Amino acid sequence: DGQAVGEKIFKTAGAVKSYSDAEQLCREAKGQLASPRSSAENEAVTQMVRAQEKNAYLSMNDISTEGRFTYPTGEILVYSNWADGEPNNSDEGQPENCVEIFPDGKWNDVPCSKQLLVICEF
Ligand SMILES: [Ca+2]
Ligand SMILES: [Ca+2]
């Protein structure tokens, strides 16, 4: 089941995990973390966040080069939807290398230790 755009399918079982535990769960299922590359893909992920009532991880991170957000291929973003003033690399001054998506579809950079909804893509 889940939500689809073109050949891409998004699914969740309601699991709530850290970034590294979320990545392991999606890879064990033979997929990867949600990686919305267009407005239409972003809207499909956002509908699932609203249904589950919990912010979700996206795949993308800046662990390599600070301020350059990349996919699991290591390629640069082809699409973004940052909330006003994001990304700011500031959890009360502390580093924020991972990305959460809100129920309004906007994005915020977070610490990779945060516990969030797990949404996978296939
Ligand atoms: Ca950062
Ligand atoms: Ca932030």
CA angle 21, 26, 31 (to 5 degrees): 155
List the beta strands (DSSP E) in the chain: 3-5, 8-11, 16-17, 32-33, 56-57, 98-101, 107-110, 116-117, 120-121
Q: How was this structure determined?
A: X-ray
Number of domains in the chain: 1
Output the CA 96–ligand 2 centroid distance in Å: 6
CA angle 67, 121, 84 (to 5 degrees): 35
Handedness of CA 62, 39, 84, 14 (dihedral sign): negative
In three-state secondary structure terms, 22 is helix
Output the CA 120–ligand 2 centroid distance in Å: 22
CATH number at residue 3: 3.10.100.10
d(CA 63, CA 49): 25
Output the CA 26–ligand 1 centroid distance in Å: 23
- Inter-residue contact 58 to 36 (CB < 8 Å): yes
Output the CA 50–ligand 1 centroid distance in Å: 26
Question: Which range of residues forms the domain containing residue 115?
Answer: 1-122
Q: What does this entry list as its resolution, in Å? A: 1.2
Burial class (CB in 10 A: 0-12, 13-18, 19+), 97: middle
